[PDB]
């Protein structure tokens, strides 16, 4: 089998909220390596979380997660995991578990991601005066808000498509 | 001090086959203390995982062709492609892990001089169409779900506050 790394446990939170996140990993001897977290912001910058040693014993961690982020490993399930208290705007991203060849190199196989939202706080004190009808009312004018700019992001794509096509039709 | 890892430049054009080269450069030096210089190269296609290319500085990742070659020292490294192909367009990222906290550079974007036309498509081979063809799907699914996620952001607060009243 090749090497697959699946996270999962992503999700929306509330700040201050907690989350705990997987990775499951199958095709290789899970015990034999240390894990690591990686996460992109939506900024598209990448940022080191954690790294947890082949056995569990050592754990590392930058001082913008250390105190809230615990990573730990059950070497029996083939399972990583990421323990995240306390979120902050600055942790939405989406985050990657990844393998390491210890001594070597530190990320060399990578899973699909999983994405973290954290939410704004500030929407939860804005609507607690408002009525029910009108928070219903906005609650239904925004089914037809999303799915019209999820439609125009395929017609961007349909747009980038077509001289691609008639290239490959041209030859 | 935490070290921070520079990339020149942010976006680079090219042509299929041209030389590209890429810096980065540490603020300090980047010497673990076994004595190795843990200075790795990864390569990231949009809306997909990042995937490694050169670590050590210069060593070859399994499966990655000739024509990468990652060099420096002290604090300035490079990463070049002789030859541009068409699998080796997206974002490139340093990366240093000599110093706790291990620190990403800031991306540098090799993409094609596209221009206002189309016509630069004409001498791709259609096997190389293909490839640009199948990389869009990667990035217009990643922008939906950036929608999907925004409106969780912009409901959940509602549907809070509904039963909560």
């Known amino acids: 089998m090749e090497v697959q790394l699946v996270e999962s446990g992503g999700g929306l939170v509330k700040p201050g909220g907690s989350l705990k996140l997987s990775c499951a990993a199958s095709?290789?001897?899970?015990?034999?390596?240390?894990m690591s977290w990686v996460r992109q912001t939506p900024e598209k910058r990448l940022e080191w979380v954690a790294t947890?040693?082949?056995?569990?014993?050592?754990?590392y961690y930058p001082d913008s997660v250390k105190g809230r982020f615990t990573i730990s490993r059950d070497n029996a399930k083939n399972t990583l995991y990421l323990q995240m208290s306390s979120l902050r705007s600055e942790d939405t991203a989406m985050y990657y578990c990844?393998?390491?060849?210890?001594?070597?190199?530190?990320?060399?196989?990578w899973g699909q991601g999983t994405t973290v939202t954290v939410c704004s706080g500030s929407d939860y004190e804005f609507l607690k005066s408002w009525t029910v009808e009108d928070l219903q009312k906005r609650l239904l004018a925004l089914d037809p808000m999303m799915e019209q700019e999820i439609e125009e992001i395929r017609q961007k794509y349909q747009s980038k498509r077509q001289p691609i096509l008639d290239a490959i039709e041209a030859k | 001090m935490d070290v921070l890892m520079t990339q020149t430049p942010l976006s680079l054009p090219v042509s299929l086959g041209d030389q590209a080269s890429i810096s980065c450069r540490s603020s300090?030096?980047?010497?673990?203390?076994?004595?190795?210089?843990?200075l790795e190269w990864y390569l990231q296609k949009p809306g997909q995982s990042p995937k490694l290319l050169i670590y050590?500085?210069?060593n070859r990742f399994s499966g990655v062709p000739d024509r990468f070659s990652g060099s420096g020292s002290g604090t300035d490294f490079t990463l070049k492609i002789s030859r541009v192909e068409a699998e080796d367009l997206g974002v490139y990222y340093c990366?240093?892990?000599?110093?706790?906290?291990?620190?990403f550079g800031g991306g540098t974007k090799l993409e094609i001089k596209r221009g206002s036309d189309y016509e630069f498509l004409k001498s791709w081979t259609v096997e190389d169409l293909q490839k640009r063809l199948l990389a869009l799907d990667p990035m217009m699914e990643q922008e939906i779900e950036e929608i999907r996620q925004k409106y969780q952001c912009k409901r959940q607060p509602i549907l809070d506050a509904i039963e909560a009243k």
């Open positions: 990844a393998s390491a060849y210890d001594g070597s190199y530190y990320f060399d196989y």
């Open positions: 095709g290789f001897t899970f015990s034999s390596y240390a």
């Open positions: 947890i040693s082949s056995g569990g014993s050592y754990t």
């Open positions: 300090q030096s980047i010497v673990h203390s076994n004595g190795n210089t843990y």
């Open positions: 050590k500085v210069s």
């Open positions: 990366f240093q892990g000599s110093h706790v906290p291990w620190t």
